[PDB]
Amino acid sequence: AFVVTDNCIKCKYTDCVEVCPVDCFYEGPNFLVIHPDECIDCALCEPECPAQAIFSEDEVPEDMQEFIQLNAELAEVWPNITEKKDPLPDAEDWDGVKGKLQHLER
Numbered sequence: 091a092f093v094v095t096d097n098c099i100k101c102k103y104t105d106c107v108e109v110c111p112v113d114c115f116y117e118g119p120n121f122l123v124i125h126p127d128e129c130i131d132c133a134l135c136e137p138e139c140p141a142q143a144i145f146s147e148d149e150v151p152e153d154m155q156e157f158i159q160l161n162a163e164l165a166e167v168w169p170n171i172t173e174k175k176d177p178l179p180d181a182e183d184w185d186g187v188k189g190k191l192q193h194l195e196r
């Protein structure tokens with residue numbers, strides 16, 4: 091599975107969903123997650139993310155390991171998103187800011 095990590099929080103560009111063949115992205119107020127059992131590891135989404143927040147599971151940075159299980163848990167409770175929508179209104183201000191997990195909304 092591929093995993094969405096910190097820098098998606100408060101950006102949520104949603105470019106990643108247009109390339110996913112199996113539609114395994116789930117939507118939260120201000121972040122997206124990949125459902126691990128549905129992802130077929132095609133790697134097509136990782137180049138699409140403007141925030142470069144998507145990583146192959148095996149390449150998730152050492153200080154971002156919690157996102158692995160967080161993607162799994164939140165994918166069981168958030169709704170499925172299959173279409174690109176507009177970025178969060180001030181996505182570019184937050185793109186690049188570190189430690190955004192403290193701002194995650196359920």
Ligand code: SF4
Nearest residue numbers: 110129130132133135
């Ligand atoms: S690797 Fe492919 S299947 Fe997995 S989320 Fe990305 S685009 Fe979808």
Ligand code: F3S
Nearest residue numbers: 098103104105106139
């Ligand atoms: S910001 Fe998040 S919504 Fe997709 S395009 Fe990047 S993982």
